[PDB]
Protein backbone atom coordinates (compact mmCIF):
# COMPACT_ATOMS: atom_id res chain seq x y z
CA UNK A 1 0.00 0.00 0.00
CA UNK A 2 0.66 3.84 0.28
CA UNK A 3 2.04 4.71 -3.21
CA UNK A 4 4.71 7.38 -3.40
CA UNK A 5 6.67 9.19 -6.15
CA UNK A 6 9.80 7.28 -7.09
CA UNK A 7 11.87 10.25 -8.30
CA UNK A 8 11.82 13.98 -7.65
CA UNK A 9 10.25 15.33 -10.79
CA UNK A 10 12.61 17.51 -12.84
CA UNK A 11 11.95 21.19 -13.45
CA UNK A 12 11.23 20.51 -17.08
CA UNK A 13 8.65 17.86 -16.37
CA UNK A 14 6.65 19.95 -13.96
CA UNK A 15 6.71 23.07 -16.08
CA UNK A 16 5.66 20.92 -19.03
CA UNK A 17 2.78 19.78 -16.83
CA UNK A 18 1.81 23.41 -16.55
CA UNK A 19 1.71 24.04 -20.29
CA UNK A 20 -2.11 24.11 -19.83
CA UNK A 21 -2.46 26.14 -16.66
CA UNK A 22 -2.55 29.62 -18.22
CA UNK A 23 -5.65 31.78 -17.90
CA UNK A 24 -7.69 33.21 -20.72
CA UNK A 25 -8.68 36.86 -20.34
CA UNK A 26 -12.35 37.49 -19.61
CA UNK A 27 -14.48 37.82 -22.71
CA UNK A 28 -15.81 41.36 -22.74
CA UNK A 29 -18.07 43.44 -24.95
CA UNK A 30 -18.68 47.22 -25.10
CA UNK A 31 -21.75 48.46 -23.27
CA UNK A 32 -24.54 49.79 -25.57
CA UNK A 33 -25.73 52.58 -23.24
CA UNK A 34 -22.66 53.38 -21.17
CA UNK A 35 -19.06 53.73 -22.36
CA UNK A 36 -17.61 50.82 -20.39
CA UNK A 37 -16.73 47.14 -20.82
CA UNK A 38 -19.23 44.45 -19.76
CA UNK A 39 -19.31 40.69 -20.07
CA UNK A 40 -22.06 39.79 -22.53
CA UNK A 41 -25.54 38.60 -21.62
CA UNK A 42 -25.08 40.24 -18.22
CA UNK A 43 -26.47 43.47 -16.82
CA UNK A 44 -24.09 46.47 -17.13
CA UNK A 45 -22.34 47.45 -13.85
CA UNK A 46 -22.89 51.12 -14.79
CA UNK A 47 -26.38 51.96 -16.11
CA UNK A 48 -28.29 48.77 -15.34
CA UNK B 1 45.05 19.98 -43.44
CA UNK B 2 41.28 19.70 -42.93
CA UNK B 3 39.38 17.04 -44.91
CA UNK B 4 37.08 18.09 -47.74
CA UNK B 5 33.35 18.23 -47.02
CA UNK B 6 30.82 19.40 -49.63
CA UNK B 7 28.31 22.14 -49.73
CA UNK B 8 24.79 21.18 -50.83
CA UNK B 9 24.99 18.95 -53.92
CA UNK B 10 22.08 18.62 -56.18
CA UNK B 11 20.44 15.18 -55.81
CA UNK B 12 20.72 12.81 -58.77
CA UNK B 13 17.85 10.56 -59.83
CA UNK B 14 18.18 6.97 -60.97
CA UNK B 15 15.95 4.32 -62.59
CA UNK B 16 16.23 0.53 -62.25
CA UNK B 17 14.19 -2.32 -63.73
CA UNK B 18 14.56 -5.16 -61.20
CA UNK B 19 12.84 -7.74 -63.41
CA UNK B 20 14.86 -10.93 -63.00
CA UNK B 21 17.51 -9.38 -60.72
CA UNK B 22 17.19 -11.44 -57.67
CA UNK B 23 16.40 -9.58 -54.41
CA UNK B 24 19.13 -8.93 -51.90
CA UNK B 25 21.76 -8.82 -54.55
CA UNK B 26 19.72 -5.94 -55.99
CA UNK B 27 18.97 -4.53 -52.54
CA UNK B 28 22.68 -4.23 -51.69
CA UNK B 29 23.08 -1.90 -54.64
CA UNK B 30 20.08 0.34 -54.00
CA UNK B 31 21.44 0.68 -50.45
CA UNK B 32 24.90 2.00 -51.29
CA UNK B 33 23.30 4.25 -53.91
CA UNK B 34 20.78 5.65 -51.41
CA UNK B 35 23.60 6.17 -48.91
CA UNK B 36 25.86 7.77 -51.53
CA UNK B 37 28.98 5.61 -51.09
CA UNK B 38 29.72 5.53 -54.80
CA UNK B 39 30.30 9.29 -54.82
CA UNK B 40 33.88 10.06 -53.67
CA UNK B 41 32.67 12.94 -51.49
CA UNK B 42 30.57 10.63 -49.31
CA UNK B 43 29.84 12.05 -45.89
CA UNK B 44 28.10 10.07 -43.14
CA UNK B 45 25.89 12.80 -41.64
CA UNK B 46 24.42 14.69 -44.63
CA UNK B 47 22.33 12.51 -46.99
CA UNK B 48 23.83 13.31 -50.42
CA UNK B 49 22.57 10.22 -52.24
CA UNK B 50 20.76 9.47 -55.49
CA UNK B 51 17.00 9.31 -55.37
CA UNK B 52 16.25 5.78 -56.63
CA UNK B 53 13.17 4.88 -58.68
CA UNK B 54 12.36 1.22 -59.37
CA UNK B 55 9.81 -0.07 -61.86
CA UNK B 56 8.94 -3.73 -62.39
CA UNK B 57 9.02 -4.77 -58.84
CA UNK B 58 6.78 -7.81 -58.48
CA UNK B 59 9.17 -9.20 -61.08
CA UNK B 60 12.00 -9.69 -58.61
CA UNK B 61 12.78 -13.36 -58.58
CA UNK B 62 14.24 -15.35 -55.71
CA UNK B 63 16.01 -18.67 -55.26
CA UNK B 64 15.36 -21.76 -53.12
CA UNK B 65 11.87 -22.41 -51.74
CA UNK B 66 11.45 -18.86 -50.40
CA UNK B 67 8.19 -18.13 -52.20
CA UNK B 68 6.20 -20.54 -50.03
CA UNK B 69 8.58 -20.69 -47.09
CA UNK B 70 9.80 -17.11 -46.39
CA UNK B 71 7.46 -15.50 -43.86
CA UNK B 72 7.14 -11.84 -42.91
CA UNK B 73 5.92 -10.97 -39.40
CA UNK B 74 4.03 -8.03 -37.89
CA UNK B 75 3.29 -7.71 -34.18
CA UNK B 76 0.41 -5.43 -33.16
CA UNK B 77 0.28 -4.28 -29.64
CA UNK B 78 -2.12 -6.97 -28.59
CA UNK B 79 -2.31 -10.56 -27.30
CA UNK B 80 -2.05 -12.94 -30.17
CA UNK B 81 -1.15 -10.00 -32.36
CA UNK B 82 1.66 -11.57 -34.40
CA UNK B 83 0.77 -11.73 -38.13
CA UNK B 84 2.75 -14.12 -40.42
CA UNK B 85 2.66 -13.33 -44.15
CA UNK B 86 4.56 -15.59 -46.61
CA UNK B 87 6.42 -14.19 -49.62
CA UNK B 88 3.90 -15.35 -52.24
CA UNK B 89 0.89 -13.85 -50.49
CA UNK B 90 2.80 -10.58 -50.25
CA UNK B 91 3.62 -10.33 -53.98
CA UNK B 92 0.00 -11.23 -54.75
CA UNK B 93 -1.36 -8.49 -52.47
CA UNK B 94 1.47 -5.98 -52.13
CA UNK B 95 4.30 -6.66 -54.53
CA UNK B 96 6.76 -3.98 -53.53
CA UNK B 97 7.06 -3.60 -49.78
CA UNK B 98 8.98 -6.72 -50.58
CA UNK B 99 11.77 -4.68 -52.12
CA UNK B 100 11.05 -1.74 -49.82
CA UNK B 101 11.38 -4.06 -46.81
CA UNK B 102 14.57 -5.60 -48.21
CA UNK B 103 16.10 -2.14 -48.59
CA UNK B 104 14.71 -0.53 -45.42
CA UNK B 105 16.38 -3.37 -43.51
CA UNK B 106 19.67 -2.53 -45.21
CA UNK B 107 19.81 1.23 -44.67
CA UNK B 108 21.17 2.44 -41.31
CA UNK B 109 18.88 3.14 -38.37
CA UNK B 110 18.12 6.54 -37.00
CA UNK B 111 16.78 9.82 -38.35
CA UNK B 112 19.08 9.95 -41.39
CA UNK B 113 18.51 6.31 -42.22
CA UNK B 114 14.80 7.02 -42.10
CA UNK B 115 15.20 9.94 -44.53
CA UNK B 116 17.18 7.99 -47.17
CA UNK B 117 14.36 5.44 -47.24
CA UNK B 118 12.06 8.28 -48.30
CA UNK B 119 14.36 8.73 -51.31
CA UNK B 120 13.45 5.28 -52.77
CA UNK B 121 10.26 5.11 -54.83
CA UNK B 122 9.25 1.55 -55.79
CA UNK B 123 6.59 0.74 -58.37
CA UNK B 124 5.21 -2.42 -59.95
CA UNK B 125 5.49 -2.49 -63.75
CA UNK C 1 73.22 35.57 9.41
CA UNK C 2 69.69 36.89 9.78
CA UNK C 3 66.30 35.42 10.61
CA UNK C 4 65.28 35.20 6.94
CA UNK C 5 67.92 32.57 6.16
CA UNK C 6 67.89 30.51 9.36
CA UNK C 7 66.44 27.37 7.89
CA UNK C 8 67.16 23.80 9.17
CA UNK C 9 69.19 21.17 7.26
CA UNK C 10 67.75 19.17 4.33
CA UNK C 11 66.94 16.17 6.51
CA UNK C 12 65.57 17.10 9.82
CA UNK C 13 61.99 18.25 9.54
CA UNK C 14 60.43 15.78 7.14
CA UNK C 15 56.91 16.71 8.13
CA UNK C 16 54.52 13.74 8.50
CA UNK C 17 51.79 11.45 7.19
CA UNK C 18 48.24 12.89 6.85
CA UNK C 19 46.23 9.74 6.51
CA UNK C 20 42.66 9.86 5.34
CA UNK C 21 42.70 13.03 3.24
CA UNK C 22 42.07 12.69 -0.48
CA UNK C 23 42.26 9.83 -2.96
CA UNK C 24 45.46 9.95 -4.73
CA UNK C 25 47.82 10.97 -2.16
CA UNK C 26 47.70 7.27 -1.54
CA UNK C 27 46.52 7.11 2.06
CA UNK C 28 42.92 7.81 1.52
CA UNK C 29 39.44 6.58 2.42
CA UNK C 30 40.68 3.77 4.48
CA UNK C 31 43.69 5.37 6.10
CA UNK C 32 46.16 2.61 5.19
CA UNK C 33 44.18 0.09 7.34
CA UNK C 34 42.84 -2.08 4.56
CA UNK C 35 39.40 -3.53 4.71
CA UNK C 36 37.58 -4.63 7.77
CA UNK C 37 38.61 -6.57 10.85
CA UNK C 38 39.72 -6.01 14.43
CA UNK C 39 42.97 -4.38 13.35
CA UNK C 40 41.06 -1.81 11.30
CA UNK C 41 38.64 -1.13 14.13
CA UNK C 42 39.31 1.91 16.29
CA UNK C 43 40.69 0.37 19.48
CA UNK C 44 42.33 -2.06 17.08
CA UNK C 45 44.19 -5.23 17.95
CA UNK C 46 45.12 -7.08 21.11
CA UNK C 47 48.83 -6.28 21.81
CA UNK C 48 50.80 -8.24 19.22
CA UNK C 49 53.93 -8.63 21.35
CA UNK C 50 52.05 -11.46 23.16
Amino acid sequence: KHPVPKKKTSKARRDARRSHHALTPPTLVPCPECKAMKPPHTVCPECG
Amino acid sequence: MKTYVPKQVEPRWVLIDAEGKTLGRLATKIATLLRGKHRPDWTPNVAMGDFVVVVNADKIRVTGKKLEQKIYTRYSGYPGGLKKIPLEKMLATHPERVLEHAVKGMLPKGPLGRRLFKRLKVYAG
Amino acid sequence: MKLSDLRPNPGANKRRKRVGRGPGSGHGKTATRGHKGQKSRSGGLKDPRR
Partner: protein, 110 residues
Protein backbone atom coordinates in the same frame (compact mmCIF):
# COMPACT_ATOMS: atom_id res chain seq x y z
CA UNK D 1 10.53 56.88 -19.91
CA UNK D 2 9.22 54.20 -17.54
CA UNK D 3 7.40 54.10 -14.22
CA UNK D 4 7.28 51.21 -11.80
CA UNK D 5 5.34 50.15 -8.72
CA UNK D 6 6.32 47.26 -6.41
CA UNK D 7 4.00 45.71 -3.82
CA UNK D 8 6.33 43.90 -1.39
CA UNK D 9 5.41 41.15 1.09
CA UNK D 10 1.93 40.65 -0.37
CA UNK D 11 0.45 37.74 1.59
CA UNK D 12 -0.38 35.59 -1.41
CA UNK D 13 1.39 32.72 -3.17
CA UNK D 14 3.59 33.69 -6.15
CA UNK D 15 2.41 30.89 -8.42
CA UNK D 16 -1.19 32.02 -7.91
CA UNK D 17 -0.81 35.75 -8.53
CA UNK D 18 1.84 35.20 -11.21
CA UNK D 19 -1.03 33.69 -13.20
CA UNK D 20 -3.00 36.89 -13.54
CA UNK D 21 0.10 39.05 -14.02
CA UNK D 22 0.71 36.78 -17.02
CA UNK D 23 -2.74 37.88 -18.16
CA UNK D 24 -1.76 41.56 -18.49
CA UNK D 25 1.70 41.97 -19.98
CA UNK D 26 2.35 44.14 -22.99
CA UNK D 27 -1.30 45.23 -22.83
CA UNK D 28 -2.36 48.86 -22.89
CA UNK D 29 -3.27 50.18 -19.45
CA UNK D 30 -6.87 50.45 -20.62
CA UNK D 31 -7.41 46.77 -21.46
CA UNK D 32 -5.34 45.66 -18.45
CA UNK D 33 -7.77 47.69 -16.32
CA UNK D 34 -10.69 45.91 -18.00
CA UNK D 35 -9.08 42.46 -17.65
CA UNK D 36 -8.31 42.56 -13.94
CA UNK D 37 -11.82 43.82 -13.24
CA UNK D 38 -13.50 40.87 -14.91
CA UNK D 39 -10.82 38.26 -13.99
CA UNK D 40 -12.06 36.07 -11.15
CA UNK D 41 -9.06 35.48 -8.91
CA UNK D 42 -8.03 36.92 -5.56
CA UNK D 43 -4.81 38.00 -7.27
CA UNK D 44 -6.44 40.55 -9.58
CA UNK D 45 -7.30 42.75 -6.61
CA UNK D 46 -3.57 43.05 -5.93
CA UNK D 47 -2.17 43.33 -9.47
CA UNK D 48 -4.77 46.06 -9.96
CA UNK D 49 -3.57 48.04 -6.94
CA UNK D 50 -0.05 47.89 -8.37
CA UNK D 51 -1.06 48.91 -11.91
CA UNK D 52 -2.86 51.86 -10.44
CA UNK D 53 0.00 52.90 -8.14
CA UNK D 54 2.24 52.55 -11.15
CA UNK D 55 -0.02 54.56 -13.43
CA UNK D 56 -0.21 57.31 -10.81
CA UNK D 57 3.55 57.10 -10.66
CA UNK D 58 3.66 57.59 -14.42
CA UNK D 59 1.59 60.79 -14.27
CA UNK D 60 2.37 62.56 -10.96
CA UNK D 61 6.11 61.79 -10.99
CA UNK D 62 7.45 61.14 -14.51
CA UNK D 63 5.29 63.14 -16.99
CA UNK D 64 4.06 60.16 -18.94
CA UNK D 65 0.58 60.79 -20.34
CA UNK D 66 -1.86 58.19 -18.93
CA UNK D 67 -3.63 57.76 -22.27
CA UNK D 68 -0.40 56.29 -23.75
CA UNK D 69 0.50 53.80 -20.98
CA UNK D 70 1.08 50.09 -21.56
CA UNK D 71 2.44 47.38 -19.26
CA UNK D 72 5.97 47.15 -20.69
CA UNK D 73 7.14 44.62 -18.09
CA UNK D 74 5.74 42.89 -15.03
CA UNK D 75 6.72 40.02 -12.77
CA UNK D 76 6.05 38.61 -9.30
CA UNK D 77 9.04 37.45 -7.26
CA UNK D 78 8.64 35.41 -4.09
CA UNK D 79 9.17 36.91 -0.70
CA UNK D 80 9.81 35.26 2.63
CA UNK D 81 7.29 32.59 3.59
CA UNK D 82 5.33 32.38 6.84
CA UNK D 83 5.80 28.89 8.30
CA UNK D 84 2.92 27.56 10.39
CA UNK D 85 2.50 24.18 12.12
CA UNK D 86 -0.31 21.90 10.94
CA UNK D 87 -1.14 19.08 13.40
CA UNK D 88 -1.87 15.70 11.77
CA UNK D 89 -3.05 12.24 12.75
CA UNK D 90 -0.99 10.16 15.19
CA UNK D 91 0.79 13.17 16.68
CA UNK D 92 2.40 14.13 13.42
CA UNK D 93 2.75 17.92 12.82
CA UNK D 94 3.56 19.16 9.29
CA UNK D 95 4.37 22.79 8.39
CA UNK D 96 2.35 24.72 5.80
CA UNK D 97 4.07 27.67 4.05
CA UNK D 98 1.87 30.74 3.80
CA UNK D 99 3.88 32.34 0.99
CA UNK D 100 4.48 35.86 -0.13
CA UNK D 101 4.82 37.83 -3.37
CA UNK D 102 6.73 40.90 -4.52
CA UNK D 103 4.44 42.13 -7.34
CA UNK D 104 6.05 44.56 -9.82
CA UNK D 105 4.32 46.42 -12.68
CA UNK D 106 6.51 48.50 -15.04
CA UNK D 107 4.93 50.95 -17.48
CA UNK D 108 6.02 52.67 -20.70
CA UNK D 109 4.44 54.92 -23.34
CA UNK D 110 3.33 53.50 -26.70
Amino acid sequence: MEAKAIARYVRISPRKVRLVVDLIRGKSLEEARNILRYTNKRGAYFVAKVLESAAANAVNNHDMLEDRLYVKAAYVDEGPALKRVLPRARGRADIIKKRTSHITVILGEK
